[PDB]
Amino acid sequence: GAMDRPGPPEGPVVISGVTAEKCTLAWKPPLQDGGSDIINYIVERRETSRLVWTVVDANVQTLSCKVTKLLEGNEYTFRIMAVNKYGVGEPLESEPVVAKNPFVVPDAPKAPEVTTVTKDSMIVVWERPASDGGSEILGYVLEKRDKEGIRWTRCHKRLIGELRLRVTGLIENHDYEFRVSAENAAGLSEPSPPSAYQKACDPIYKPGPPNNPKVIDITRSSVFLSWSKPIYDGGCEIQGYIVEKCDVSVGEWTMCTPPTGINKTNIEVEKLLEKHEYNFRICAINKAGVGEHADVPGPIIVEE
């Protein structure tokens, strides 16, 4: 048919790479070229307050254009026209875009730390950005890796909204290392360095004091003591008890057992000085160590 100028560029204008000084536009060719091929495109800009369109590039041989010399804080709208041998077609106008610098993802956090461990769980804790640089952190992603495993795995879906997570579902006696990432509106940070490997196992602690230490009977040179298992065994097996004596005139706590201890809740302390006055301490032994002493009630006079 008869020939004329091209149709408008097609499609939504797509704006990308927006900073405070530049941005990038892309469009698609017009559906109709008017009967002659499109020679070049014309890209124009107009700050929203202004009336005059200003030329960005009058000879764009591309479906994209890099706009520069933009000005921080100003809002712009952009225009694209197709040109052929018979003239300039109707424009394709973009949506308004403000020249802002983009938001940035947070910095990689510092390495997390494990605190409380069971055979199946670990509490992991980490720090906020030391200073509130405008990260605007929304939450965290905690990852774990088994020492006998290949890849890092998430300990949870979506985000952790605090500085801590009790990670469960851990395999007893496996060793795990942790790393944490921080996410803001811009996206996910690079991960932190890893924690040191920790083994999933129940901790053991020194035992508590022996229970109900008491005197049973007294002779001319001996004292009979008795007690019961400590209420708190330290998650560990009581393997023995240490008994100590003190002369109240002297004040030096001497031993009444080998350091190994005694495997009974009773003892007969013998060869004690007659009519002297004593105090007695009893201690429990774990694989972890010797726990707190329990003092026998009052001082005792060795008599009959």
Numbering used by the authors: 3 to 306
Paper passage:
Titin is an intrasarcomeric protein filament of vertebrate striated muscle that plays essential roles in sarcomere development, passive mechanics and homeostatic regulation. Despite its large size, titin has a simple modular structure, primarily consisting of small immunoglobulin (Ig) and fibronectin type III (FnIII) domains (ca. 100 residues in length) that account for over 90% of its mass. Tandems composed of FnIII and Ig domains are found in titin’s A-band that is an integral component of the thick filament.
In order to obtain a domain structure representative of group B and to expand the understanding of FnIII domain arraying in titin’s A-band, we sought to elucidate the crystal structures of the triple FnIII-tandems A80-A82 and A84-A86 (both tandems of type ABC) from the C4 super-repeat, which PaSiMap analysis reveals to be a prototypical representative of titin’s C-zone. Regarding overall conformation, the crystal structure of A84-A86 reveals the poly-Fn tandem chain in an extended arrangement where sequential domains display alternating torsions along the chain path. Domain pairs A84-A85 and A85-A86 are joined by 3 residue long linkers that are largely hydrophobic in composition, having sequence NPF and DPI, respectively. The copies differ primarily in the opening and rotation angle of the A85-A86 pair, which varies moderately between copies.
